[PDB]
């Protein structure tokens, strides 16, 4: 079920990432390359997401 | 790359404990150490760029089979990140750690006749920077204490005033001296200045920038270890602790 949902709905998320990237100017993007971080997700949230 | 990123004496000495001698050997043929060559640097000049090859480089070079070559390949690994080609070393030596080679009598290598002035000329010292020279003096001090030639270390330091000023201050047998050291020995690291992807002229400079840009990519890769975010995932052996001690010492 995860694979079927992934294959059917990957086009929308690929377009969504592009639209978000197009909202950032080049100067601001270069600064964000310096920062770093790690996101912690609960196991229940990840499985429910896919 | 990993060796060149070590900043403290504790981190460098710990790395030499884990790393076997085989990483100091290259297994690649390389070319002759000292030779005047014409190289291509098209970003700056159309004419070929003259340069002289040296032992302290990021590339393999031919090295003598004797104990002198083995010591030189260890130092070149620490200061440049790449060793030399010494053919047919026994498996017993290759599995030993670098620190054991420099600071233990169990290995069959005899180093008592080592001359520090000759080695410093072969591994060109007029070409090294301050951090590279400090790393070399660490290797010389470890060899002197294992051999008992601590006086020969001091006479060598007195003949070269700038080396004496920047000589790291530690006792190769006491861990308390290592912890107290405030010296910085990081050839590669995160650059405060702006680092571009342009090439450099000299072989040493271009090779060093390759390591510098590689470390930045390695910094942002998944192989890098982030202490502030994953400290509980680390094994107890590799976790940063105040009571961490080298074997013996």
């Amino acid at each position: 079920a995860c694979r079927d949902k992934t294959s059917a709905n990957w086009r929308g998320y690929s377009v969504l990432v592009s639209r978000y990237r197009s909202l950032i100017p080049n100067e601001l993007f270069e600064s964000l390359r310096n920062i770093s971080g790690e996101y912690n997700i609960n196991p229940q949230d990840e499985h429910s997401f896919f | 790359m990993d060796v060149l990123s070590k900043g403290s004496l504790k981190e460098l000495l710990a790395h030499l404990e884990k790393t076997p001698l085989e990483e100091a050997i290259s297994y690649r043929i390389g070319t002759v150490p000292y030779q005047n060559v014409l190289i291509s640097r098209n970003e700056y000049y159309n004419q070929l760029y003259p340069d002289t090859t040296s032992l302290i480089d990021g590339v393999s070079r031919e090295g003598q089979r004797n104990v002198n070559g083995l010591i030189m390949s260890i130092i070149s690994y620490v200061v440049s990140g790449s060793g030399h080609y010494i053919p047919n070393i026994g498996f017993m030596l290759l599995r030993r750690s670098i620190l054991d080679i420099l600071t233990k009598h169990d290995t069959g290598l005899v180093t008592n006749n080592l001359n520090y002035g000759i080695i410093a000329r072969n591994l060109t010292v007029s070409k090294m920077n301050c951090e590279q020279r400090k790393r070399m003096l660490i290797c010389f001090k470890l060899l002197a204490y294992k051999d008992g030639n601590q006086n020969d270390y001091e006479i060598y330091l007195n003949q070269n005033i700038p080396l004496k000023q920047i000589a790291p201050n530690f006792i190769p047998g006491d861990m308390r001296t290592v912890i107290h050291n405030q010296d910085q020995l990081a050839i590669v690291g995160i650059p405060a200045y702006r680092l571009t992807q342009s090439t450099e002229l000299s072989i040493r400079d271009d090779n060093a920038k390759s390591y510098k840009l590689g470390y930045v990519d390695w910094y942002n890769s998944n192989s890098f270890l982030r202490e502030r975010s994953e400290f509980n995932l680390i094994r107890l052996k590799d976790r940063d602790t105040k009571y961490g001690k080298l074997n013996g010492w």
């Binding site: 592009s18 990237r21 197009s22 100017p25 080049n26 | -």
Partner: protein
């Protein structure tokens, strides 16, 4: 979960050993998969473009 073991036992175990344990049990999902890079451009308009 898949093999009858606890966290304390599988501690100090390398990645290769853990992969061998899971493959023998019959579990094939023991590897990471790299993501493909999508080449994106932003049209200039008034700005130079990115």
């Amino acid at each position: 979960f898949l093999t009858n073991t606890t966290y304390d036992i599988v501690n100090n175990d390398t990645i290769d050993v853990l992969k061998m344990k899971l493959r023998n049990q019959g579990w094939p999902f023991v590897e990471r998969y790299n993501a493909v890079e999508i080449d994106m451009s932003v049209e200039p308009l008034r700005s130079p473009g990115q």
